[PDB]
Amino acid sequence: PITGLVYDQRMMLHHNMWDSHHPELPQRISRIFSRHEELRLLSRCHRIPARLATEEELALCHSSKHISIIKSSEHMKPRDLNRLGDEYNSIFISNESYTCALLAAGSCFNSAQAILTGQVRNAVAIVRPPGHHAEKDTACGFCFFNTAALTARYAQSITRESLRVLIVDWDVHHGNGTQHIFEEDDSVLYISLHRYEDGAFFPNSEDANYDKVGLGKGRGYNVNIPWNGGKMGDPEYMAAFHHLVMPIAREFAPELVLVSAGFDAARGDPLGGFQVTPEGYAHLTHQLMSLAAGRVLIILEGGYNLTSISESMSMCTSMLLGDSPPSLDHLTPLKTSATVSINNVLRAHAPFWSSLR
């Protein structure tokens, strides 16, 4: 079994010209790549080339209006770039941003193609800018185009329209964009674990609560696991996987798993406030590898402590390469509100998934 890896230093060119210390840094991807070199993981992977996504591929999930506006930013002067960025919720834009977003998406398409053709068993995509907050018609939360959503549709386009794709989103923030893109769809199961705080945590919407289960034929196919009032870590995430993620995933029987792999729930993150360890992320990855005959693509989303994300994503790659899971620290009893969250999701999803009964 071969593991794929995609990384292209051109994705570093997207930058914040007014605030060069903004946490969505160019060096997020070079640091993760460097740590893979350090641990001698890079030579163990098959290197998959990056490419630009096409406008036609972007149209799988995004409106032409949205594509056109972001495309136009490539030739704007700094004042217009500042003005445009400020129209969105939490976005900065440079002349290279559009191209970088295209590269992120096209990198993941090549990776999914490699997985689905059998060239690799699984893969990791060290990409930026991130995707999961991007909506059909707007940019949001450092995201321009919804890389993971686009990848699911790209995968369906080269196999069959009803290919069952599981998206597990373990970034500490709710993937608002991914939820909305697939909300009426039963071919793409969306499972998000996120810090919620009764709607007080970015992106600040009650769309992230456990009662949002999908619409129309997508009823039951949107699973939100919202955390409230607690510094959640390995015990809570392992419990969520045991009680919710894995039973639902096995019943869905995905043919491809995409991980919206933010590392901002990691111990040390400046924004997330959580304490998931690298060993934690390794165990989550290892569990997901039991699905879809091991066809797993890990896509970088958020995560802002450069040391933490580097160690955490490298450990995921180590798992995809078939290395033995590292030992977790003794798992303490769950924070009381985490039990409450898990039970709430169980109640909301019991009608749709017989494995939860």
Q: Interface with K ion by CB under 5 A: which range of 53-61, 209-217, 248-256, 282-290?
A: 209-217
Q: Pick from 280, 302, 309, 353: which binds Zn ion (CB under 5 A)?
A: 302
Which residue lies nearer to K ion by CB, 122 or 192? 192
Q: Number of residues in contact with Zn ion, rule: CB under 5 A?
A: 5
Give the number of residues in contact with K ion, rule: CB under 5 A. Answer: 11
The yes or no reply on residue 210 touching K ion (CB under 5 A) is no
173 binds Zn ion (CB under 5 A): yes
Does 349 appear as a known binding residue?
Answer: yes
Q: Residues 144, 145, 182, 202: which binds K ion (CB under 5 A)?
A: 182
Residue nearest to Zn ion as judged by C-beta position: 302
According to the annotation, is 173 in a ligand binding site? Answer: yes
135 in contact with Zn ion (CB under 5 A): no
Q: Tell me whether residue 296 is annotated as binding.
A: no
Q: Is residue 171 a contact point for Zn ion (CB under 5 A)?
A: yes
Q: Is 14 annotated as a binding residue?
A: no
Contact partner, 283, from Zn ion, K ion, none, Cβ < 5-8 Å per class: none
Of 14, 15, 133, 286, catalytic: 133
For residue 133, indicate whether it is catalytic.
yes
| Comparison of 57 and 171: residue with beta carbon closer to Zn ion | 171
Q: What is the 3-state secondary structure (H, E, C) of the chain?
A: CCEEEEECHHHHCCCCCCCCCCCCCCHHHHHHHHHHHHCCCHHHCEECCCCCCCHHHHCCCCCHHHHHHHHHHHHCCHHHHHHHHHHCECCCCCCCHHHHHHHHHHHHHHHHHHHHCCCCCEEEEECCCCCCCCCCCCCECCECCCHHHHHHHHHHHCCCCCCCEEEEECCCCCCHHHHHHCCCCCCEEEEEEEECHHHCCCCCCHHHCCCCCCCHHHCCCEEEEEECCCCCEHHHHHHHHHHHHHHHHHHHCCCEEEEEECCCCECCCCCCCCEECHHHHHHHHHHHCCCHHHCEEEEECCCCCHHHHHHHHHHHHHHHCCCCCCCCCCCCCCCHHHHHHHHHHHHHHCCCCHHHC
Binding residues vs K ion (CB under 5 A): 169, 171, 182, 185, 190, 192, 194, 214, 218, 221-222
Catalytic residues, which ones? 133
In the annotated binding site for Zn(2+), the residues are 169, 171, 173, 178, 182, 188, 193, 212, 260, 264, 349
